[PDB]
Amino acid sequence: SAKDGDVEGPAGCKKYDVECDSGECCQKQYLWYKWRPLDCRCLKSGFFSSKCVCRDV
Amino acid sequence: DKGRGANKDRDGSAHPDQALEQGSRLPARMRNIFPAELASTPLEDFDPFYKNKKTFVVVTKAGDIFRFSGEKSLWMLDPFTPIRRVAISTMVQPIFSYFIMITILIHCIFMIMPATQTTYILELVFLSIYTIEVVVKVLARGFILHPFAYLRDPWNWLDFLVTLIGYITLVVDLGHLYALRAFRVLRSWRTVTIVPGWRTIVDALSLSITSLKDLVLLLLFSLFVFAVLGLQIYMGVLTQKCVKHFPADGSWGNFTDERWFNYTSNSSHWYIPDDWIEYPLCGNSSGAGMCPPGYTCLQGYGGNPNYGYTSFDTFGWAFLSVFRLVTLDYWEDLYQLALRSAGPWHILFFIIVVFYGTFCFLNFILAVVVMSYTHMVKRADEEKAAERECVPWQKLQGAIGAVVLSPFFELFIAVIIVLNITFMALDHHDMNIEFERILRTGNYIFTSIYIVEAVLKIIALSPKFYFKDSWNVFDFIIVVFAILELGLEGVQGLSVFRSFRLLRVFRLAKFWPTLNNFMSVMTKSYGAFVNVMYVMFLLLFIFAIIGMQLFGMNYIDNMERFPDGDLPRWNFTDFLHSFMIVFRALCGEWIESMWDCMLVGDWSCIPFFVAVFFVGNLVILNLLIALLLNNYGSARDSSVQRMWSNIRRVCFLLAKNKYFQKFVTAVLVITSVLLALEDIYLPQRPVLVNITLYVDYVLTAFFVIEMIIMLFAVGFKKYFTSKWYWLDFIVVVAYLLNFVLMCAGIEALQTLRLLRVFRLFRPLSKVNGMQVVTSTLVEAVPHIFNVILVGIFFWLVFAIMGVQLFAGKFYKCVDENSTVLSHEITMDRNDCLHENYTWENSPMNFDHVGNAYLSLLQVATFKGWLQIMNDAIDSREVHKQPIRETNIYMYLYFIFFIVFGSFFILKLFVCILIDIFRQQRRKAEGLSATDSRTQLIYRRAVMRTMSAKPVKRIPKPTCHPQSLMYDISVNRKFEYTMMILIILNVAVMAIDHYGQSMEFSEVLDYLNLIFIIIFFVECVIKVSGLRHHYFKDPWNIIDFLYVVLAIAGLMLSDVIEKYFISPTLLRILRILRVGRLLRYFQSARGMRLLLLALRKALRTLFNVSFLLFVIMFVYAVFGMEFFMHIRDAGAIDDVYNFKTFGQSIILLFQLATSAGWDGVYFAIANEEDCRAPDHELGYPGNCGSRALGIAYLVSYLIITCLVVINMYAAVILDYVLEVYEDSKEGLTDDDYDMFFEVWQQFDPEATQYIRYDQLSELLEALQPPLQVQKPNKYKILSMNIPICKDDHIFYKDVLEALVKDVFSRRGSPVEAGDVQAPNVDEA
Ligand SMILES: *[C@@H]1O[C@H](CO)[C@@H](O[C@@H]2O[C@H](CO)[C@@H](O)[C@H](O)[C@H]2NC(C)=O)[C@H](O)[C@H]1NC(C)=O
Ligand SMILES: *[C@@H]1O[C@H](CO)[C@@H](O[C@@H]2O[C@H](CO)[C@@H](O)[C@H](O)[C@H]2NC(C)=O)[C@H](O)[C@H]1NC(C)=O
Ligand SMILES: NC(=O)OC[C@@H]1N=C(N)N2CCC(O)(O)[C@@]23N=C(N)N[C@@H]13
Ligand SMILES: *[C@@H]1O[C@H](CO)[C@@H](O)[C@H](O)[C@H]1NC(C)=O
Ligand SMILES: *[C@@H]1O[C@H](CO)[C@@H](O)[C@H](O)[C@H]1NC(C)=O
Ligand SMILES: *[C@@H]1O[C@H](CO)[C@@H](O)[C@H](O)[C@H]1NC(C)=O
Predict the structure, then answer these.
(1) Which residues in chain B are closer than 8 Å to A21, comparing Cβ atoms?
(2) Where residue A38 sits, what CATH number does that domain have?
């Protein structure tokens, strides 16, 4: 009921800004005044090194 | 020769040596009154070790020519055997000059660090060292009283003036004369002598400054005639600001007497739209910008753009605004401020000052620097002509070595390396987890192939012949750095071993030969580049410390002048900020850094930033071009035949007529000016729409009928194999397709109608000079395509390095309108979205390599490069707020790109066009290819003899008016005294200023009545004495047209006086008469070698601009289709846009010099917050195109700004280099025009013969190089002129004899049997 930073999905849910691996993110999280979906993106950190994190879309 | 006799002039009792140092020598000689065994003819080594060192210095001192030794020679001008002899022995030591060089490289390190309590205790010891070598090198030898003493050479003259500075700033002077301690950095110019080969650049840098004496005085004259011309027509124009009307029946006073001057001239009644800094200008003209509703444009009301420093209202400030326009730095802010206030027809001012200012007079400077470098290189190559003149182990090695021998295995590594560069150039920010998984496992494969390959190669060849060549040892270092990467990833301390997998991009150099031949020359001539790179970074060190000492405390003391009271991002407040503000002025940009210098300090900023532009950009950058020109110089079928070949014979006669192919040219030029009238005002002009509709139907009938005439003239085979007739065929197909569509429904495509602009290039290449210009753009089109591809490669290494440093950064948390928030308010994305802000990205970024190339072309053309640097310095981490200036050493990424990617790669386009035009002009002049270097100098002297005739002297008539006007209308005294009055007519125009007074324009108007009547008398005398000959001189019809318009302005003033004798057009004609000075001086031979080189190029420099106007015509028509409805953003606004054909040429002339294509790109490639075209209603929609906007601009900059603007420099450098090869080898074109000037002093008629008596006075009256002094009669007997009967000689047979006298007395064996062999080959 938009009580806090709260997320809906299955068990084993990995929240926003937490490291993920190929589909171990969640369906949708209420994080910044809206409900936003989440994929498992991979960012940039240093030369030729990616660090993968659940990100909103 | 002269110095060779001067070398012997020192030998006999003039100045005897005392020591010798050549190949580890330390001798001791004297002045032959008590000398000690120097040498005479033996080469001895027995007695002295100074002689034993001179035995090896018997052959090594005179090894190359003469210059290995150095001798403290004074001939004992003061008895040289006290303890003075010991200081000679110390000064010749190699450890002494190696010690002073070390203490200078230390003292430079203590300048760049900030001061402390131990600076004064350490600036005192280095002053004590440098005062010992000035007292040793004088008490060993030295006065100013004799040759070789101490103050002869400038290097010891640099010790002395700087050490006197060090003793002035230590005694009395504390606050006054405090600016002198900045010049103790000038001693650091001594360390040029540490890099080998320093003499061939410093002497070329010295010959360039002493050869520009004749050009600076010519450029100071042309800026003066433009600062006057800009002052007369732009004074007060740049202060025009729209001022609201005085309020009708409002809260102000009634009578508009002095309340109109308190309402206006109150800053709250000027416009200033929406939080802007400067106030917008407007104009009463037609295309000028206007004011909103209820306002009005007014002149005065103080405030002048850029703090008051951009103006034309004083001769001092008009001389600065014209100089930045010759320079071309930020000149579109002056271009756009003078066309907005004075209307769009003032582009004719800026075309003249850019043509004669920066396409001519900045390419004469390039030509002097190129000829000064190639004189000191070719001099330094005579010195290169003097130096030069088990059982299973050996089993598999035949099987493993079987595969690494073939090009098949060399192909296999070549497929992987092109594929490995692709996986480095695909990673980016915010990439999928499956897409990123491929690039990780591709690294484990590509490293594994490189390890198998290295081991295999070592086993196959040997483990000791593997390290022979440079490629197999470069490959082994890659396997070293890659095998560390697969072990140091679990450490994860620092990813610097992840940086050297970028080094394997250069493996592609050993495979494809274009990049291989490019690498080969950079290694063959490495000594040339490292010298000029060291000189350039040493000048920037001198100017950085001078700027930091002069302007440093001003930026900290009174910051309050700056907007918002903060420091600029570019200031003289530290070393690293002083270096980058000097370095960006070597790149061209100095006017914006000079405004806030002079805002916060004094007048002394102006001599600083001119001297760093003149030295840094006009000399050092032109030596760097000049290196490239030397290193990179490489039934019954016979009865139907009388019907088919009957038409075929007639139709071939149409194509050969001069009236048919002039008709077709006239159609294509009329029908394309119709195409420049299709603008945004077209769908309300109903008669013009129907004209341009029924012309598109006649043009389809004209293109098909012309095609059938060509196919019935040249035939099928020679039509479709030629490149011009394929331009014909595509256009006919393009207009059949628009006729198909509009009969059968669909409205025509407006981008297929615009293809008949591409048909104006066939009659363009037939213009009389245009065959030379268009032949070098066709011959050099495969040479640019190699330089683009080599350019893409080195740019790719910087781009896939810029991604790995800057991707994911350049985000920031920005406020409602545009203002970037601060740290300690928000510091990440969590703190930004929680406070309901937005987290925007920068427009130009480094996310992937597509975004890299656009952001890296910004910094290569220096247009938009301050925002990318201001983004790169602030970035710290991927999801954090950018704190300003927290990462200051990312400037080093941009210095290494501007050197290797702007100064080097983009200056290769200049190197191509200079090479190709020099050899296509030789083909177009009919000359033999690869004839000689000097024989063409003799051909151009004979071919100029055959085509010359005398000139008739002016026939004096016989009347009482006519005889005594012509006496004074021809005198050289009268030509001077009517020229010194033209000059004083124009120096009076330079003391006009804005709002001068009424009593000041009472003198200067009555003084303009004295000169207006002397020029009426001169224009009567020179017509009463010269009947019709007066109107033949172009500087007399301009003198005639001025006195007509200036008598009509005074008498018959109020005729109708609407606008007839408008005083602007008289001001333009007063200043235009100063151009007689160009045909005035001949005693300045250094200037007339540049005026004559200019005049021989104006016909082929009009053709380069006339090709540029056609290219500007093509894109202005395509630009009005694509980018006409774009909404107003950044640079495209209500005045400068793509709506009409007028507004398109105003922008494409600006963008021809790449000035501000970053602001044009930001509008025409804007796809955010735009409406959509609702074609079923109308409304074409204000939305730009990203893909069409890139291809429009990037193709334009590689046409005008890289291969047409660089075409003017290829023409100037070709003709200037020819003219100087006629003053040093014989007979310039002004030499012939003086012989026929002294010929009519003896032959004042139409005859071509003279008397044989007068020959002794021909050869005495003229100037050299054709004189023969007295007694000449034995020089004429041997000269063998063919005497015709009745004692008459012919001018050709005397001119040919004065030619063969010059070539004999200068060219000994290369001109006797050559300059006579060529004249027999024509006669
Ligand atoms: C531009 O034109 C306007 C009118 O066309 C000029 O405005 C007049 O200015 C004078 C003094 O400058 C006033 O006394 C008049 O009352 C103004 N008349 C109107 C109708 O505005 C204006 O001076 C011109 N600006 C220039 C030439 O810079
Ligand atoms: C911005 O944050 C504020 C709180 O600082 C949120 O406040 C809402 O404001 C609206 C009125 O605009 C109220 O009706 C709500 O009760 C407030 N709370 C919520 C949870 O909506 C506001 O939501 C944020 N801004 C936006 C656009 O959502
Ligand atoms: N910002 C930037 O690139 O700085 C360089 C210089 N300075 C400006 N203020 N400009 C206005 C825009 C611009 O193109 O960047 C530029 N216009 C020219 N001719 N050079 C640029
Ligand atoms: C206008 O006059 C008033 C006095 O009536 C004066 O206070 C004001 O400063 C004047 N305006 C300007 C711009 O000086
Ligand atoms: C004009 O100047 C006066 C000075 O007294 C100032 O008060 C006022 O704000 C200014 N603007 C107007 C519209 O009066
Ligand atoms: C925009 O910035 C200005 C300052 O230039 C500020 O006054 C304003 O509040 C901001 N937002 C707007 C204009 O609504």
Answers:
(1) 433
(2) 2.30.130.120
